[PDB]
């Protein structure tokens, strides 16, 4: 009746969201298998221990895989969840092209297993981590919720779109379900404290963490994936949104579920697009470092540009992304500088 | 021929017929099935397979198991050397799908993903998949060629088939070492000529033909025709009925194609000719010599007016075509029904 299950909560967006939830008086229970998150010293992952410290509130956590029915059943028997925020999954567009089965497995099969447990336990309130990739190659920009979905350019985007469809079907089959599908754009930045941030395990697939690792000196130079796109400078254009703003959108989503909203879909973006080179520039500026780069071939699955029309979320969720580029860059750099090796090494 | 061909859902309708064709064509099948929609034999083998053994004088290796059981699947791939996999296993009750979506996603999606993962792990990268004309969504033009748009399915069952195609297409695009033939079946009907095996619907049939045959035999009072106000010659739905034996043979063609290291290939398995509900009723009265009373009721949710294949690509590239006609299909269906009033058993 009270707890909020947060899958993949030790990750980038999840950790920030657990923070916001706690600050807002909610009671999160987090699960993660650490596939893409650093393991803390103690029971808690590093990221979560830090959130526990920043908020002053306990973080209930369990190490587990969403693909383990057993563990999930156990978890649901142990806690009385009121809702589920589902972040757990694989998220690299380019990797998906090469390892489709891993994506279908973790993203599709893992979500199906979670929905089955939820249904079984009567916890029919969900917030799902969707993505702008479900729009496939943009037919128009900015992207609104009315733009066609499907015809994705990569297996990851298909996996997200397929999940949206399953959810719509589930909601059609049972009107008692409420589900908010959040199509995020490109989150960046970090908690203002600089204590938590984006700390991928291994080499970063995302632009910004890679860029920050270059500025801090952990990486020699950034590889720019193509410069022959139909954009102002030829490099990819994305709608960067502060991870803090994005995290806050989850609280608004929780409120929407309480209205017995049914199945709803909202973009979570700023509406302002920035190119690869513009991001590098903003980061040189924030870090005071030179961010060497070189142009390589395009990365399969990538689109030239994508940015959101965030009006719907403002109208129905009463949410808007407050923070801008400067703030994103500044927050990112603060985290990087305070944590040159991320959470640990 | 020492390597084996794994046939999932092989105790079922299309699968059993396919197993028979594989044996006759010299392949060595290993069949798996969980009995979800197949009748348990008196012994270990499913009845359908027991009969296929007698009809061919050849043996069928069989293991009772669920594709969702990773442990059993992993053991299976250790036990045998497979050169290819023909994947028939799955749930197919469209109506139930609209009500139990997750069951459909679990069995069809998760089941396939597991199978593909185990195949990969053991170096088996040759697949034949049971797809369906439903992936084309509501027809935008007729006849339906492989290039007609896919997706936009109207029920979970259909969406699941489309999702599986996409996954396989993605796997093939990623890895040029994979070969996969996606077969879009249209409306399988008929039965093996011996009348020994056929479609054995569990409970009230959801498809037209078994409902028709069951009426003929008196197992059902009368046929309910789902609408007669469609934009068709007689107003009833039009479909491309294709003999299960021809369909089965298409799978042998598929194996041959895989041998060509064909990558991802997609072919319709239809005849190219559509027939209306009323036309099938008349053809069944002709074949059976029995009365088949009907009554026109409301349209059934999700039905399209007409659906039929463009069989050219299959003929030219898969090197296959349906040889059996309408009368043969009805005749064969009737023989099976007549000789087995209650389907399988003893
Ligand atoms: N970062 C981005 O730009 C975007 C992210 N998304 C989605 O948001 C979600 C969270 O993304 P991020 O926080 O950026 O990535 P992340 O990799 O930091 O977070 C995902 C978390 O899931 C965990 N995880 C992975 N597989 C798991 C499994 N089988 N069981 C349990 N935990 C598992 C990982 O260890 C990780 O902590 C994902 O679903 C992602 O696809 C969608 C759009 C934007
Ligand atoms: N009959 C038709 O009109 C069409 C059939 N298809 C597809 O062709 C395939 C075969 O169709 P049919 O022979 O008519 O159906 P069927 O139900 O007779 O055959 C499927 C077989 O799969 C087995 N099975 C189900 N779930 C299983 C699981 N989890 N593990 C192991 N075995 C399992 C069932 O027990 C059954 O013997 C299916 O994938 C179906 O969706 C596609 C188009 C048309
Ligand atoms: O080393 C790198 C990494 C990225 N890029 C480019 O930078 C941009 C952003 O790339 P990336 O951070 O990988 O983000 P996306 O591929 O746009 O996808 C992100 O944003 C999507 C929503 O827009 C989510 O679906 C994905 O999970 C999330 O990874 C693109 O134009 C990339 O080509 C480079 O040039 N070099
Ligand atoms: O009791 C019945 C059953 C069917 N019909 C009609 O007969 C036609 C055929 O219906 P049915 O046998 O259920 O076949 P389809 O709905 O066309 O679907 C079959 O063929 C599809 C591909 O064409 C596959 O996706 C399915 O799995 C398979 O069941 C349609 O016009 C129906 O409206 C009736 O009038 N009465
Ligand atoms: C029209 N667009 C392809 C430039 C978005
Ligand atoms: C006869 N065979 C080798 C083609 C199976
Ligand atoms: C194997 N094939 C040449 C008949 C396509
Ligand atoms: Mg390639
Ligand atoms: Mg009469």
PDB file of N, CA, C and O in Angstrom, chain B residues 111-132:
ATOM      1  N   UNK B 111       9.657 -17.451 -25.067  1.00  0.00           N
ATOM      2  CA  UNK B 111       9.983 -18.776 -25.536  1.00  0.00           C
ATOM      3  C   UNK B 111      10.928 -18.733 -26.717  1.00  0.00           C
ATOM      4  O   UNK B 111      11.886 -19.464 -26.762  1.00  0.00           O
ATOM      5  N   UNK B 112      10.674 -17.864 -27.701  1.00  0.00           N
ATOM      6  CA  UNK B 112      11.533 -17.758 -28.862  1.00  0.00           C
ATOM      7  C   UNK B 112      12.907 -17.207 -28.525  1.00  0.00           C
ATOM      8  O   UNK B 112      13.902 -17.706 -29.011  1.00  0.00           O
ATOM      9  N   UNK B 113      12.916 -16.170 -27.702  1.00  0.00           N
ATOM     10  CA  UNK B 113      14.185 -15.557 -27.304  1.00  0.00           C
ATOM     11  C   UNK B 113      15.067 -16.600 -26.633  1.00  0.00           C
ATOM     12  O   UNK B 113      16.238 -16.723 -26.987  1.00  0.00           O
ATOM     13  N   UNK B 114      14.500 -17.392 -25.717  1.00  0.00           N
ATOM     14  CA  UNK B 114      15.283 -18.451 -25.082  1.00  0.00           C
ATOM     15  C   UNK B 114      15.843 -19.438 -26.071  1.00  0.00           C
ATOM     16  O   UNK B 114      17.036 -19.825 -26.046  1.00  0.00           O
ATOM     17  N   UNK B 115      14.961 -19.877 -26.972  1.00  0.00           N
ATOM     18  CA  UNK B 115      15.383 -20.806 -28.009  1.00  0.00           C
ATOM     19  C   UNK B 115      16.528 -20.233 -28.848  1.00  0.00           C
ATOM     20  O   UNK B 115      17.522 -20.933 -29.113  1.00  0.00           O
ATOM     21  N   UNK B 116      16.392 -18.971 -29.273  1.00  0.00           N
ATOM     22  CA  UNK B 116      17.444 -18.361 -30.089  1.00  0.00           C
ATOM     23  C   UNK B 116      18.771 -18.282 -29.338  1.00  0.00           C
ATOM     24  O   UNK B 116      19.826 -18.528 -29.933  1.00  0.00           O
ATOM     25  N   UNK B 117      18.681 -17.938 -28.032  1.00  0.00           N
ATOM     26  CA  UNK B 117      19.868 -17.824 -27.187  1.00  0.00           C
ATOM     27  C   UNK B 117      20.555 -19.169 -27.028  1.00  0.00           C
ATOM     28  O   UNK B 117      21.775 -19.275 -27.100  1.00  0.00           O
ATOM     29  N   UNK B 118      19.780 -20.228 -26.778  1.00  0.00           N
ATOM     30  CA  UNK B 118      20.392 -21.553 -26.649  1.00  0.00           C
ATOM     31  C   UNK B 118      21.001 -22.026 -27.959  1.00  0.00           C
ATOM     32  O   UNK B 118      22.068 -22.675 -27.985  1.00  0.00           O
ATOM     33  N   UNK B 119      20.297 -21.727 -29.075  1.00  0.00           N
ATOM     34  CA  UNK B 119      20.796 -22.089 -30.377  1.00  0.00           C
ATOM     35  C   UNK B 119      22.163 -21.441 -30.578  1.00  0.00           C
ATOM     36  O   UNK B 119      23.131 -22.108 -30.928  1.00  0.00           O
ATOM     37  N   UNK B 120      22.204 -20.142 -30.334  1.00  0.00           N
ATOM     38  CA  UNK B 120      23.453 -19.378 -30.472  1.00  0.00           C
ATOM     39  C   UNK B 120      24.610 -19.967 -29.645  1.00  0.00           C
ATOM     40  O   UNK B 120      25.718 -20.165 -30.142  1.00  0.00           O
ATOM     41  N   UNK B 121      24.309 -20.262 -28.374  1.00  0.00           N
ATOM     42  CA  UNK B 121      25.266 -20.812 -27.429  1.00  0.00           C
ATOM     43  C   UNK B 121      25.873 -22.107 -27.900  1.00  0.00           C
ATOM     44  O   UNK B 121      27.012 -22.423 -27.552  1.00  0.00           O
ATOM     45  N   UNK B 122      25.113 -22.870 -28.692  1.00  0.00           N
ATOM     46  CA  UNK B 122      25.591 -24.138 -29.188  1.00  0.00           C
ATOM     47  C   UNK B 122      26.028 -24.080 -30.631  1.00  0.00           C
ATOM     48  O   UNK B 122      26.251 -25.095 -31.273  1.00  0.00           O
ATOM     49  N   UNK B 123      26.129 -22.876 -31.170  1.00  0.00           N
ATOM     50  CA  UNK B 123      26.581 -22.734 -32.540  1.00  0.00           C
ATOM     51  C   UNK B 123      25.586 -23.143 -33.620  1.00  0.00           C
ATOM     52  O   UNK B 123      25.976 -23.359 -34.758  1.00  0.00           O
ATOM     53  N   UNK B 124      24.295 -23.255 -33.258  1.00  0.00           N
ATOM     54  CA  UNK B 124      23.253 -23.639 -34.223  1.00  0.00           C
ATOM     55  C   UNK B 124      22.620 -22.330 -34.717  1.00  0.00           C
ATOM     56  O   UNK B 124      21.975 -21.620 -33.947  1.00  0.00           O
ATOM     57  N   UNK B 125      22.872 -21.993 -35.978  1.00  0.00           N
ATOM     58  CA  UNK B 125      22.383 -20.732 -36.509  1.00  0.00           C
ATOM     59  C   UNK B 125      21.566 -20.829 -37.785  1.00  0.00           C
ATOM     60  O   UNK B 125      21.677 -19.972 -38.661  1.00  0.00           O
ATOM     61  N   UNK B 126      20.775 -21.901 -37.865  1.00  0.00           N
ATOM     62  CA  UNK B 126      19.913 -22.189 -39.004  1.00  0.00           C
ATOM     63  C   UNK B 126      18.501 -22.377 -38.463  1.00  0.00           C
ATOM     64  O   UNK B 126      18.280 -23.311 -37.710  1.00  0.00           O
ATOM     65  N   UNK B 127      17.584 -21.481 -38.847  1.00  0.00           N
ATOM     66  CA  UNK B 127      16.224 -21.518 -38.336  1.00  0.00           C
ATOM     67  C   UNK B 127      15.136 -21.386 -39.370  1.00  0.00           C
ATOM     68  O   UNK B 127      15.282 -20.685 -40.353  1.00  0.00           O
ATOM     69  N   UNK B 128      14.010 -22.060 -39.100  1.00  0.00           N
ATOM     70  CA  UNK B 128      12.823 -21.930 -39.924  1.00  0.00           C
ATOM     71  C   UNK B 128      11.779 -21.520 -38.889  1.00  0.00           C
ATOM     72  O   UNK B 128      11.646 -22.162 -37.834  1.00  0.00           O
ATOM     73  N   UNK B 129      11.040 -20.439 -39.147  1.00  0.00           N
ATOM     74  CA  UNK B 129      10.060 -19.969 -38.194  1.00  0.00           C
ATOM     75  C   UNK B 129       8.627 -19.928 -38.732  1.00  0.00           C
ATOM     76  O   UNK B 129       8.402 -19.505 -39.863  1.00  0.00           O
ATOM     77  N   UNK B 130       7.666 -20.347 -37.881  1.00  0.00           N
ATOM     78  CA  UNK B 130       6.240 -20.315 -38.166  1.00  0.00           C
ATOM     79  C   UNK B 130       5.689 -18.896 -38.014  1.00  0.00           C
ATOM     80  O   UNK B 130       5.289 -18.465 -36.943  1.00  0.00           O
ATOM     81  N   UNK B 131       5.669 -18.149 -39.113  1.00  0.00           N
ATOM     82  CA  UNK B 131       5.117 -16.809 -39.079  1.00  0.00           C
ATOM     83  C   UNK B 131       3.679 -16.832 -39.618  1.00  0.00           C
ATOM     84  O   UNK B 131       3.117 -17.913 -39.816  1.00  0.00           O
ATOM     85  N   UNK B 132       3.085 -15.664 -39.863  1.00  0.00           N
ATOM     86  CA  UNK B 132       1.698 -15.646 -40.324  1.00  0.00           C
ATOM     87  C   UNK B 132       1.348 -14.423 -41.139  1.00  0.00           C
ATOM     88  O   UNK B 132       1.906 -13.344 -40.922  1.00  0.00           O
TER      89      UNK B 132
END
